[PDB]
Curated annotation (Swiss-Prot), chain A:
Organism (species): Oryctolagus cuniculus (Rabbit)
GO cellular component, one term: nucleolus
Protein name as it appears in the record: Small ribosomal subunit protein uS7
A UniProt-annotated Pfam family: Ribosomal_S7
Location of the protein in the cell: Cytoplasm; Nucleus, Nucleolus
Coiled-coil positions: none
PROSITE patterns: RIBOSOMAL_S7
Annotated keywords: Acetylation, Cytoplasm, Isopeptide bond, Nucleus, Phosphoprotein, Ribonucleoprotein, Ribosomal protein, Ubl conjugation
InterPro entries named in the record: Ribosomal_uS7, Ribosomal_uS7_CS, Ribosomal_uS7_dom, Ribosomal_uS7_dom_sf, Ribosomal_uS7_euk/arc
Recorded family membership: Belongs to the universal ribosomal protein uS7 family.
UniProtKB/Swiss-Prot annotation, chain C:
Job description of the protein: Scaffolding protein involved in the recruitment, assembly and/or regulation of a variety of signaling molecules. Interacts with a wide variety of proteins and plays a role in many cellular processes. Component of the 40S ribosomal subunit involved in translational repression. Involved in the initiation of the ribosome quality control (RQC), a pathway that takes place when a ribosome has stalled during translation, by promoting ubiquitination of a subset of 40S ribosomal subunits. Binds to and stabilizes activated protein kinase C (PKC), increasing PKC-mediated phosphorylation.
Protein name stated in the entry: Small ribosomal subunit protein RACK1
MF (Gene Ontology): ribosome binding; translation regulator activity
Subcellular compartments: Cell membrane; Cytoplasm; Cytoplasm, Perinuclear region; Nucleus
UniProtKB/Swiss-Prot annotation, chain D:
Name under which the protein is recorded: Small ribosomal subunit protein uS3
Cross-link type Glycyl lysine isopeptide (Lys-Gly) (interchain with G-Cter in ubiquitin), residue numbers: 40, 52
Cross-link Glycyl lysine isopeptide (Lys-Gly) (interchain with G-Cter in SUMO2), where in sequence: 52
Entry-annotated residues carrying Phosphothreonine: 58-59
Assembly and binders: Component of the 40S small ribosomal subunit. Identified in a IGF2BP1-dependent mRNP granule complex containing untranslated mRNAs. Interacts with HNRPD. Interacts with PRMT1; the interaction methylates RPS3. Interacts with SUMO1; the interaction sumoylates RPS3. Interacts with UBC9. Interacts with CDK1; the interaction phosphorylates RPS3. Interacts with PRKCD; the interaction phosphorylates RPS3. Interacts with PKB/AKT; the interaction phosphorylates RPS3.
Entry's localization field: Cytoplasm; Nucleus; Nucleus, Nucleolus; Mitochondrion inner membrane
Similarity-based family: Belongs to the universal ribosomal protein uS3 family.
Coiled coil: none
Whole sequence portion shown: 163 to 227 of 243
Domain of life of the source: Eukaryota
Modified residues (Phosphoserine): 47, 62
Post-translational modification: Methylation by PRMT1 is required for import into the nucleolus and for ribosome assembly.
UniProtKB/Swiss-Prot annotation, chain F:
NCBIfam families: PRK01151.1 (NF002242)
Name of this chain's protein: Small ribosomal subunit protein eS17
Domain of life: Eukaryota
Assembly and binders: Component of the small ribosomal subunit. Part of the small subunit (SSU) processome, composed of more than 70 proteins and the RNA chaperone small nucleolar RNA (snoRNA) U3.
Gene Ontology cellular component annotations, sorted alphabetically: cytosolic ribosome; nucleolus; ribonucleoprotein complex
One example GO MF annotation: structural constituent of ribosome
Function: Component of the small ribosomal subunit. The ribosome is a large ribonucleoprotein complex responsible for the synthesis of proteins in the cell. Part of the small subunit (SSU) processome, first precursor of the small eukaryotic ribosomal subunit. During the assembly of the SSU processome in the nucleolus, many ribosome biogenesis factors, an RNA chaperone and ribosomal proteins associate with the nascent pre-rRNA and work in concert to generate RNA folding, modifications, rearrangements and cleavage as well as targeted degradation of pre-ribosomal RNA by the RNA exosome.
Amino acid sequence: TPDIKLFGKWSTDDVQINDISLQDYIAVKEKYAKYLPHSAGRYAAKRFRKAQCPIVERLTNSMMMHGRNNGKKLMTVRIVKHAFEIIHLLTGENPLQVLVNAIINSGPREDSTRIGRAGTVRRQAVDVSPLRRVNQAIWLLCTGAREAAFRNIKTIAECLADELINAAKGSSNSYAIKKKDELERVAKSNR
Amino acid sequence: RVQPIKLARVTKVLGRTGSQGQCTQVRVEFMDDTSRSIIRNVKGPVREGDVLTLLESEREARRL
Amino acid sequence: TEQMTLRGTLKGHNGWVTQIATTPQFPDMILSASRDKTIIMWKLTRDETNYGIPQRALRGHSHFVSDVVISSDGQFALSGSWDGTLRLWDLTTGTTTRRFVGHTKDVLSVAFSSDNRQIVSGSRDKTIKLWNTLGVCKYTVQDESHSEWVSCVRFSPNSSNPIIVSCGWDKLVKVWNLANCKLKTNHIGHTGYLNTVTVSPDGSLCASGGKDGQAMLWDLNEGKHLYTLDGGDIINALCFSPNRYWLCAATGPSIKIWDLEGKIIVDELKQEVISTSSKAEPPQCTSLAWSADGQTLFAGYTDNLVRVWQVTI
Amino acid sequence: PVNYYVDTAVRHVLLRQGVLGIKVKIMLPWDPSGKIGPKKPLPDHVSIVEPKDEILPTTPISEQK
Amino acid sequence: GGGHVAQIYAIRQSISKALVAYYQKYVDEASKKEIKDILIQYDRTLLVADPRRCESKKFGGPGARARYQKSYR
Amino acid sequence: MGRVRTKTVKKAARVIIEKYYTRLGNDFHTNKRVCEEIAIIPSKKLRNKIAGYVTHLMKRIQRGPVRGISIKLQEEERERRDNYVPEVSALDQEIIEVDPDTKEMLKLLDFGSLSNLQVTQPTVGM
RNA sequence: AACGAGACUCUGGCAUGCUAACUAGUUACGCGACCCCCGAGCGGUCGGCGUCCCCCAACUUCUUAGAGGGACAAGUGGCGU
């Protein structure tokens, strides 16, 4: 704790958002290292503020989904802490770096909007903001991990690690990666 | 006929379109060369200084 | 033969620095009052980045700390506040010795006698109160005494007898006799509102000034009005020098110092800014205290910063 | 101020045909002198005193005593 | 008071505020400022109390903003 | 926005300022005390809201005359400014230059004058 | 100018400030005891979490309910007649 403010026990320093633009709604800690993916957190009042929120916590929040799981942050924090450990065993590294990478890789660059189009409503290829890219990515990965975990013996921490790792280097094994490519493919036509 | 990928940085936030009001107008400094500057439509929440990844790099919209 | 340069600047307050007090016992100490509701005692190094560093914060007041004073020794502090009370603190440490209650409104001004055996206060209640160190209020120079607000009250250096001098919005300066507790003399002539007043070192003069900008010189002894000096802008606080014949006035635009004999304008201190455009500006100096050795001059400014100047030949 | 200012009463007056409802409402002006009432002015009030007295550029001078 | 997480946040705030309150009366100001700096910087509210508190539920929903259910016809 | 001062407030501000300018100030804290002296205001929140808007005015007035407010001091200042007059501008310099006909205007007006001729060309409508 | 809105009232957070409290607590004794040895000491003795003693102890910090002050988008910087 006093030397450097590590994560559960992981270093914030030396993790670099390998992707210009995204830089910065992915919030590691260009100084902000903490200890735990839990905070009082008031993000809601402002439109932007959410970006400030540590990406780790942001990921943890998205974890607690589905009516029953709402509000179970302690459970998510527990899952997140485990996932980072599994990821680390799987590739060394900073699992936090692994997390960041998956996020950078998953945000749909291009997308589609349902432009009115007269009749046979066609869809217009539009580029996607970086806030959306981050927001969307974290969903994709969480929905990915949650969906996989449900009928299988494997635990969310594990499924999360699997989704995160495959995404970190976009294996396309991942549900999320396949989804992102689908959303983008759609963006390109339409145009 | 074509492919490339373009980095562009937000210069000035124009206002909001889509009848639903969910697409934000943007003006982009062209990143690799500043001597370019164009109007693009956005899905997400966008604020000055952050970056778009343009596919089409001509086009340049308006309403819809 | 000689002018004043900006030696350094003291930090740390956030509100505006409303009052300052020096000590001769320890010329190294500085007490300062602020909006922030805290009083700060500072030890002056001269050193090398803040002219000094803050020793203590004196909590406790709920409301703007308007005026403050220290003992000669540097042992005790007397603060006045909007909160409607007065506090005697131990510099050394903290711990309020006593609370002076009784005023109906904001206590604008505080002062203490040389004996250290009187405390007087001015307030928005339009009354001036005399109190013991105990906290007992002996007198309320009542009396239609001010039609108005009371900006400041000061205790005259001595002798024949105790004299107090008040300044009020009513556009007048008042001399009071403590022994009898009856009004001594009405000085009339100001024609705006009197912000501050100060007695000279030896208690024969009076300088009072406010909004028009007319610093006023009066002969207290003769009971005659000397003359007027045009500052132009509004003056927040006045202070005679201990050794020199210099009166310093914190105006809206800056600190103007001038010399009575001979009569000239010694200086205008304006601290600067660099490359700024610059627009708006002035946290004008609201407070000023002369050093024990007339060498140093401390000023409290709206930027929440105390700016220090030292005289050099 | 409704609580302070106005008294109201409802009365049912039975008549051969049916019943009528009489509603009486009285607004009592001790905002003026009421009186001395729970507020006096109707919170929606604001009297200015301007000066009320004053004069004279009149040069210096001083009076003894 | 509060509950399990609620309590944790309160105790930690009390401890840091404590240490600073202590340096303010006994040690010197620069030290305490140094401490407020480190906390306030990285933070978590350590020296300042978070406002956020229950909003009252209003008839017609069992929550504050939650509104019951309607079918129309 | 959501805080748009209403007339009951805004009026009082114009009001006081008209009869109080040299008394009032730059600073919220003091006028607030002043409103107690110079006005009878029923709740503290109103009196605060008043002190506050009138200060926002004083801040503005003290940077440029404001659309509907007059005080004795501002009248005096405009009065003095509204004196100016130089070497003076016409001159117009030796000799007026005429457009003629305007030359024939004097010529057939029994009037001497300085002179110059440059008046020719017609002359389209629109 | 008035009416509704608003202002208005109510509730709840920021007040080591205010005045107070045995039908509310806290500190801290006096605290011994119960008293365990929990560690140290061979033990007397020291440091230690609680309960209980209650006192001609002290307090109002938590608690309380009354009065107090704070927000006026106050300062500053972009934008807009």
